[model samples]
Target chain A: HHMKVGLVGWRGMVGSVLMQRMVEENDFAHIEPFYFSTSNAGGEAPSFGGKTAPALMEATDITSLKQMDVIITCQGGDYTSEVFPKLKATGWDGYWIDAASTLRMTDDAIIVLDPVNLNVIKDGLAKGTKTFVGGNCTVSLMLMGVGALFQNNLVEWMTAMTYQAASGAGAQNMRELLTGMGYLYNNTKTLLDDPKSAILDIDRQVAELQRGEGFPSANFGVPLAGSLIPYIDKQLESGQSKEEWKGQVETNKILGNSQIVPIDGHCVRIGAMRCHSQALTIKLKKDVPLDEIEDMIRNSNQWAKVVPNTREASMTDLTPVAVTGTLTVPVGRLRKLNMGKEYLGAFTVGDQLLWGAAEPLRRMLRILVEYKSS
Target chain B: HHMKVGLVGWRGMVGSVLMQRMVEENDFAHIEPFYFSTSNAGGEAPSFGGKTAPALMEATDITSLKQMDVIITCQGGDYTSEVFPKLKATGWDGYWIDAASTLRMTDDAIIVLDPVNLNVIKDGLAKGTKTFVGGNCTVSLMLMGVGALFQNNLVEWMTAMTYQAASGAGAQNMRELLTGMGYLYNNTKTLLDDPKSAILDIDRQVAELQRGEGFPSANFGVPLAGSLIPYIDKQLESGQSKEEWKGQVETNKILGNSQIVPIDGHCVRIGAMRCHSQALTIKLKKDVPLDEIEDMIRNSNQWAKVVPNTREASMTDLTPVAVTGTLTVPVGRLRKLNMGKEYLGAFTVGDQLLWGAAEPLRRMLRILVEYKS
Candidate 1:
């Protein structure tokens, strides 16, 4: 059970969540952990999970990284692009699990979402796939919600109108969201206090402040409070943002089926803190009854909880507030779209940091460890 | 151009907006205004536009309501249902402009969004169509965005995923939204001060505060700050909300086309103040070039402003903050979806109270005034 597992970028947001998840699942007990850092090398290691670890080591030192049985990183793409090739050139045959999207679309690597794509991982492992990467936050959350529909081969196409959260951008962007929210409240404190104040007047004041030089838009490059950004990631030449492009590429890679279902939609960043929500207009290959569709969703995964398509259930359980900071993925508002019986509609919310970023990396590490032992 | 205009429900949200717009556009100069009230009948009239309106009259008084050349009400559905029929029964042949949905789908009533459906309104007026009601906020907003596509006969079908504002629900819902937002910020003030605080910890605090009994949900029936409501209005038997139902029925009614194109999608309420934003997936009947499409949208209406398809333009103009309180409907994020050439994607934002509810009623009043003169 003993192995040296090198963890890079262990102090970042995704890395912190990965560290927390591994400790919670008692994954630290199976390995002798080594914490690597780009800036904090030789600093005091994080104290958690009742494991005593040595001082942090430099992440650039491939000599030290080559000795580990597994190396996982939330160190971002630059670190991966810089260090991964050199590590591989050193004849290291260990697993490289990553949270970055840099290696996700690489031909040699497999995108990991074990609950939805466990067999893909198994087949990849059997075929000697050493690199595992997490899918895009929205794509991972979408598959988690309706993986059974794809598994049953009912999907013909999907249009995802995403209400993505601030956390998906980074920790700094989340801080900026909160700061902007506070700025809006503080500036309009008196107006909001008077319930009878003209709503348009209050809206004008808030808009003035948002467009002023005083509002915080440095992290997001625009005010996201009381508003939304219609684009995410870098804009591609094809008019799709790089993040939107990931919807088709990363999703198909994880499903191991490219061009199986044409997926496309608008990816918008809303003001929600941590949970990303999507309104999915799914075009099924044929007419399926609502009962069977609900059953398929319920059996998708342990975490994909199917909320009843009722107002009370949706208000109580299916929202960003209810799903944020939790492992549960509540998919509700499920019904056939008025377009036709074949056009199905659903809404889902999931914690972007958990299943979207960190959980997959830690779970892939577990898969690698067990596969090696077996 | 002098006309007797009976204005009921001048104290509500949409009514107030109507009043403000009328005053700003110098609409009161052409008419002698009469303000009516449900509970505030004896209250003083609104002072605006140098028009000295008399004391507020009771809205239920058909005798007082029958004398006007035009009657407009933003008093909501109940008042409309209770009084509209009785007023009609008395053979009050004046123009009835409404902001309520009660009379919108009626066989004789014409849904009005003049910029998008001016010709329909004209035909209705010429044919003596007395009752003119505003279209649903989201529907009007959608038409305002891409009325050109529908007008050019390029659209085959459309899916509208809306990010509606709290104001669409009512003034009380808007108050509740602000209350919930302040509640979230206040509860996490200490945590938000430290940049290093765990976001999960802050999120847990906000969620706890929202779910707690102290959080205000009386108006919205749920906390709307830091969250969203997937359903907007009454749930219909067909799984579409009454609000969603309005998207198709009202849009077509305004366009005066019943089933030319299928329109359907999800309608959600987000934590915005007075602007409703929609992400539109339009299926064109033919593969139109982007230039032709963009030009068509630009020439659709005066208020349907086409924001350039650039990140800077979208971030600046194509947002609730930019579109709120303005007549401009900034539609951007226009690009051909990866689905295909004929599958076009667009995003649009408009002030819900303006183009959605109040502006249409006021404009129809102007049409009636000019027609009578």
Candidate 2:
């Protein structure tokens, strides 16, 4: 009953996380995972799920790829749009799960939100869907944390402000943020705390971090060490940034919720590590009690947790000192806004790669396997 | 015709700016200003208001203070608590203006945001009130900026999220925040960026910063360099921080608006050096067009400037590295929320010292002159 899987872009951060999750979940017990790094024809052999495998890939041409039961790609978006069409033509009838944004909104493709939409995933797979794409990171963080509520048709509309992390850009971008901080501390010494010895000019110190040309800060364009960048993704026709557009459009598509969910959100990149924290003001469709609403979020899945909202508890998630690398979304600050019972405020945090990227892709792959087995 | 005023805590940050504004407005022309450092009395003569007149202080005694027309104190709350009753017992007939919060809600004391409640201030002075306290920073910042809306009875309720800067704790706090950021940078570098190595541990690094506690961050408790602290002041029994409580109650008192305008606010300290930014979603009493609200805020006074929310002009006074240092409160992002026409979103920014802490303190000195003359 088991089938084989070929993973393209196995060397990437998302791919690396994808491999770890599959091993952790035993997701490959019914399906054998074969590692494939497109250019690693004869490199040092890598292991896949505790089993010895061919070093990366001998060949990844359409003919070679046609042998697998499914192909999961973590390759960049441009590469996928270029090659997926040719690979589809080879009559390789295997399932295709992508981590790229290229085909997400395509009419034929299903964007996965997993267990929140367990039956929906099964129905899409059983209907003979060939392509599935992962939702955007911030989108995944929100729905994976709150889809428990939305699954019951509770959310009417929401306004959100995101404190995104560095790793959302790339693993290298994360390192770059760290390296810029290093560069700043070494030269400035105690200057950060002593501005009026008249020695540490903030504007000048910021320029010092910015003008360092060759280091890792090149990825972010400015030193994001202690700063905030309000712009993410390209601007759209609607005056909303592309990331904000995704929060509105993709959350609905995953839920099949509405034409528009009346969401106003801004995706801001912060200096935090893996998890993304969102401050949401939601107006529910029907008035619901507080206990049931907390139950709706925390009880949906292990991936959704209700954290205590005490002062001692809030620091564990929202601060720069938070540790949240698991697939679970640590949600807290669920309260009724001052307006009325129908309005509420919520804060959600999740790992950018686990739940945000690879987790959804891997879960969709599992759904595909279950569909075929059934 | 001249009233004698005593300036304590001049060497402190807010006290320094309090000195500047009074001098800029020539607040001493109608009142003879006296300088008091409490410790520097009888030292080398100190200059004030572009003129050197007196050594720090010859006598700040309650017996001597009773001779002055008005006495202003920038001394800490402890000093005020100890000396104020004695100064009043001497039956000092002079008006008392404070930068302390202690006397603010005291029955006869007026919390001055200046001209916003000029009539209230005039009447309070006419009734022979003795004490006046400067309002809290975030409260002063909001009312000085948008009080006209409340004065016109245009607002119903507001929910605010304050993106506060380090200077609210004083210049020393700003320095402490930067030093904390510096420490976080060295150990947790890139560690905070790419967290999953499980390699770059956050709690341990925060511990390292905490252990190196001989530095300025001891005041903040947690490292606040690249991070933000949601609690600004003490926590109240109602589950709101002291700063949040001030926002709810003080706005109504300053404007005499209502018992409840229903304000929801959180004061958070970010690593920004100077300015404080607040994002406000307000519901109005009645339906009003967007332009009129903008005009109402803009035309209220020169202190409230409406910056065009166009693409190029958007980030100037509001962001972390903004160049705003005046008494101006920059207001932008005036838009109707998607919920209904009654709901609106606004972004406001002001220098923590100028509009927030010092400007109102300085203006009250001028108010005493009008009250007396």
Q: Which ten residues in a row have the lowest lDDT in candidate 1 chain B?
A: B174-183
lDDT of 2: 0.70
Instruction: Give the per-residue lDDT of model 1 (tens digit) for A238-350.
Output: 87788788998887788888555778888999988888999888889999999999988888789998888777787778998788778999999888876789989899999
Top-lDDT structure, candidate number: 1
TM-score of candidate 1 chain A against the true chain A: 0.97
State which docking tier applies to candidate 2: acceptable
TM of each candidate vs. truth: 0.98, 0.84
DockQ-derived CAPRI band for the predicted complex in model 1: medium
* Clashes by residue pair, model 2: A178-B190
Q: Which stretches of candidate 1 lie over 4 Å from their true place?
A: A258-260
The digit string of per-residue lDDT tens for model 2 on B36-88 reads: 65777767654666555566673356665676677677666787887788887
| Model 2, C-alpha of B365: deviation from truth (Å) | 2.5
| A1-374 per-residue lDDT for model 2 (tens digits) | 77788878866777878877888988767777677656767676566566666666643466667778888899878778877888888777888888998988988888887866667677777787888888899888888778777778777777676777777888767666656655655666555545455322553465445445543456766456655555566755544567767887788888776556666645666665556777677779878987888888878888777766555565445454443456667777666766677877677777787888898888888777777777
